[PDB]
Design an enzyme around this catalytic site. Structure first.
Site, short mmCIF file in Angstrom:
data_model
loop_
_atom_site.label_atom_id
_atom_site.label_comp_id
_atom_site.label_asym_id
_atom_site.label_seq_id
_atom_site.Cartn_x
_atom_site.Cartn_y
_atom_site.Cartn_z
N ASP A 117 -3.09 -1.94 -5.52
CA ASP A 117 -1.93 -1.02 -5.56
C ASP A 117 -0.75 -1.88 -6.05
O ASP A 117 -0.10 -2.60 -5.26
CB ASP A 117 -1.68 -0.40 -4.17
CG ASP A 117 -0.43 0.51 -4.10
OD1 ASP A 117 0.49 0.44 -4.95
OD2 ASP A 117 -0.39 1.34 -3.16
N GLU A 142 2.17 -5.91 6.36
CA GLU A 142 2.01 -4.62 5.77
C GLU A 142 1.25 -3.79 6.80
O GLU A 142 0.02 -3.74 6.78
CB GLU A 142 1.25 -4.69 4.44
CG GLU A 142 1.47 -3.43 3.60
CD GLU A 142 0.49 -2.31 3.92
OE1 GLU A 142 -0.52 -2.18 3.20
OE2 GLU A 142 0.72 -1.53 4.89
N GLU A 197 -2.99 4.31 12.45
CA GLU A 197 -3.48 2.98 12.85
C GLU A 197 -2.80 2.38 14.11
O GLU A 197 -3.37 1.50 14.72
CB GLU A 197 -3.48 1.97 11.69
CG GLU A 197 -4.17 2.52 10.43
CD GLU A 197 -4.43 1.45 9.38
OE1 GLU A 197 -4.20 0.24 9.65
OE2 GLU A 197 -4.85 1.82 8.27
N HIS A 201 -1.47 3.94 -3.15
CA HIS A 201 -2.68 4.20 -2.36
C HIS A 201 -2.43 5.00 -1.10
O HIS A 201 -3.37 5.54 -0.49
CB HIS A 201 -3.38 2.88 -2.08
CG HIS A 201 -2.87 2.16 -0.86
ND1 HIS A 201 -1.69 1.51 -0.83
CD2 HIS A 201 -3.42 2.04 0.41
CE1 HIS A 201 -1.49 0.98 0.39
NE2 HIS A 201 -2.55 1.29 1.15
#
Ligand SMILES: CC(C)n1ncc2c(N3CCOCC3)cc(-c3cccc(OC[C@H](O)CN)c3)nc21
Ligand SMILES: CC(C)n1ncc2c(N3CCOCC3)cc(-c3cccc(OC[C@H](O)CN)c3)nc21
Ligand SMILES: Nc1ncnc2c1ncn2[C@@H]1O[C@H](CSCC[C@H](N)C(=O)O)[C@@H](O)[C@H]1O
Ligand SMILES: Nc1ncnc2c1ncn2[C@@H]1O[C@H](CSCC[C@H](N)C(=O)O)[C@@H](O)[C@H]1O
Lengths: 344, 344
Positions: free
Chosen positions: A32, A124, A133, A281
């Site tokens: 990406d 990230e 997540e 992405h």
């Protein structure tokens, strides 16, 4: 045992670290260009934030962000990674002759020991719709290692939401669900499961991109400040909204996207996943109402988007929305963990 | 502690039953017309195997097969289902007015109680490549409830394998891995991981269909007889082969598919996933050789395909092969639980 295992079911963790342990998944993120080029630029254009400094990379993956910190002159970088990708990262550190500067530390950032406090934390940790997540909480947890007045890269995150109209999308999901409306599937009556079926399909957020012309009102913005937030702030995220409708039509749901800013000493750099910006992405994320709302230009669509963190490294999303001028109301619950990846 | 929990890592089981708890997954199997249509025919056309009989449906999902048993006139059907799909099955039994004839039993077939022995077992326990999911062991376990001389639908399964040539699929792996063969990806030399990326891609069986012209020899089959086999028979599956090559070319791996037969009193009905038959949701499976083998027509390609069961509900696959005339050989290791679903 740890802060991590206490908030995370076994099966979720096992599946999650297996996914990131694949070189193919790391590649997908690395490739990406908007993501990886923006991270590199934020770091290199803010070199005085790294030069002779001590860095922590939360969830280093391939090691990519740590190499950028090294390029910007960091004295020491601790690269923490809990998947088997850690061993691959240590191979790259040796082949790139940076054994003296980048120290891979295998394991969860909630569970490892770092030898010293750090000047700046890079990561990230953004999932789709930003919050998937629960890795933002690991990023916040890591602040136990940050020196007073240390920095965070990224520094802040903005979530944007806006009402959209997309009858095609609505009817695509509706059509799959109405399989369970058949009264004679091979002679069997499925229709008693039609309600359960509409609920299941509409519980899934939709991950894909779209044309901006589907948007019906200016976006409402919610900001997380990573320098100031504590991990407990992210257990329950409450986003009230009041949209001033710019267009007439059926409101099929809310669209979500996010930006993060790297607020450095030299310059602030933005990474955006907005639908007005080049594709990443992350795409964008849409939550459909099974019962869409009719509104007129100039109406106000008001309500609350509530995110309740769960043990499966995600969030239970509730969206209650109403058209003030008619008292027309829509209540919805979505399972962020299990979306329709429509872009595949 | 049950036979199931002892062979199965908790975390794999959680993920497995969540997957089958979704109506969309049940719907996917249901809408495979060749599959569902063939079960229905096999049951209805063997009506004397069902008329006034006692039936066990192992893993009923929505209940679909049990309704076919009922269409065929069975007196009593015990429908066992370990996922939360059991609740939905219960709803359908009620709305189809069959509470007197179908009894949904929530739980694992290895853990529940049946109040009586049965005349016939029905099930669809076939994973991709037949063996994935290790549900064939649940089906065989269920024979503890079968009356002496009771039957099983399906009765036998045949796995077929055959060597294939497919230069472009083989190449695809290096194209993908060569992402890592860059000396300066944003300034980073990724080259040291190229070999690891190659190994990762080759370890994944390829789930997809293909044109029969890739096949280089007549298939060899391996038969499980469900009436005779014990669970322990499926822990280690050794499939020797000696292929007599029909075409000259470069052998890039082995292709796999499978058939089942319902051997009833009135007739035998077949369900085939062969590449010569209309597509099913199982597709076919190919295991690549990281080193291809040159063979000319007339040569014999000999070796062994060994499947070793593991606690993640799947198999580790070892394929060793050689061209007898030249002695050149290839050795391959694959993880059946984590294939490349190339068709998506
Ligand atoms: C629980 C998380 C790890 N997860 N699990 C599966 C999955 C996923 N897919 C993609 C389609 O195949 C099935 C799974 C995409 C994504 C995904 C999709 C879009 C963006 C994305 O960003 C990951 C961030 O870069 C990590 N910081 C991740 N996440 C997935
Ligand atoms: C652990 C097992 C249950 N599992 N887990 C995931 C998964 C799966 N997918 C589909 C592609 O995206 C990722 C997950 C397909 C399949 C799959 C693919 C092809 C055929 C298939 O047949 C299931 C049998 O009909 C059940 N008796 C199942 N199995 C999956
Ligand atoms: N609590 C935790 N401790 C250590 N690593 C974690 C973690 N939670 C997530 N991770 C890891 O963090 C990574 C996020 S993906 C980003 C990878 C890399 N820094 C890059 O930008 O390209 C994954 O590799 C995941 O395994
Ligand atoms: N050990 C076990 N005990 C009980 N049910 C099981 C099981 N293993 C798998 N299952 C269930 O078996 C089903 C296999 S898919 C078949 C569903 C249905 N019979 C149909 O033909 O359409 C899944 O719903 C799965 O949850």
């Amino acid at each position: 045992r740890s802060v991590f295992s206490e908030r995370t079911e076994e099966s979720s963790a096992v599946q999650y670290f297996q996914f990131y342990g694949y070189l193919s998944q790391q590649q997908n993120m690395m490739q990406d260009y908007v993501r990886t080029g923006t991270y590199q630029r934020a770091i290199l254009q803010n070199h005085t934030d790294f030069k002779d400094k001590i860095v922590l990379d939360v969830g280093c993956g391939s090691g990519i962000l740590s190499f950028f910190a090294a390029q910007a002159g960091a004295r020491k970088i601790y690269a923490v990674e809990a998947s088997t990708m850690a061993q691959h990262a240590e191979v790259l550190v040796k082949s790139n002759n940076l054994t003296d500067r980048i120290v891979v530390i295998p394991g969860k950032v909630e569970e490892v020991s770092l030898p010293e406090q750090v000047d700046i934390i890079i990561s990230e940790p953004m999932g789709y719709m930003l919050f998937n997540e629960r890795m933002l909480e690991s990023y916040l947890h890591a602040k136990k290692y940050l020196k007073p007045s240390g920095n965070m890269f990224p520094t802040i995150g903005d979530v944007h939401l806006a009402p959209f109209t997309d009858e095609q999308l609505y009817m695509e999901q509706f059509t799959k669900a109405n399989f369970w409306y058949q009264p004679s599937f091979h002679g069997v009556d499925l229709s008693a499961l039609r309600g359960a079926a509409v609920d299941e399909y509409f519980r899934q957020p939709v991950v894909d991109t779209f044309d901006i012309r589907i948007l019906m009102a200016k976006s409402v913005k919610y900001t997380v400040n990573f320098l100031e937030a504590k991990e407990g702030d992210l257990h329950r995220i409450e986003i009230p909204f009041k949209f001033h409708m710019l267009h007439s039509g059926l409101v099929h749901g809310l669209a979500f996207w996010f930006d993060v800013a790297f607020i450095g000493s030299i310059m602030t750099v933005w990474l955006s996943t907005a639908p007005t910006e080049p594709l990443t992405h992350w795409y964008q994320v849409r939550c459909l109402f099974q019962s869409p709302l009719f509104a007129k230009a100039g109406d106000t669509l008001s309500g609350t988007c509530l995110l309740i963190a769960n043990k499966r490294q995600s969030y239970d999303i509730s969206i209650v929305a109403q058209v003030d001028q008619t008292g027309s109301k829509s209540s919805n619950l979505l399972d962020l963990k299990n979306p329709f990846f429509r872009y595949t």
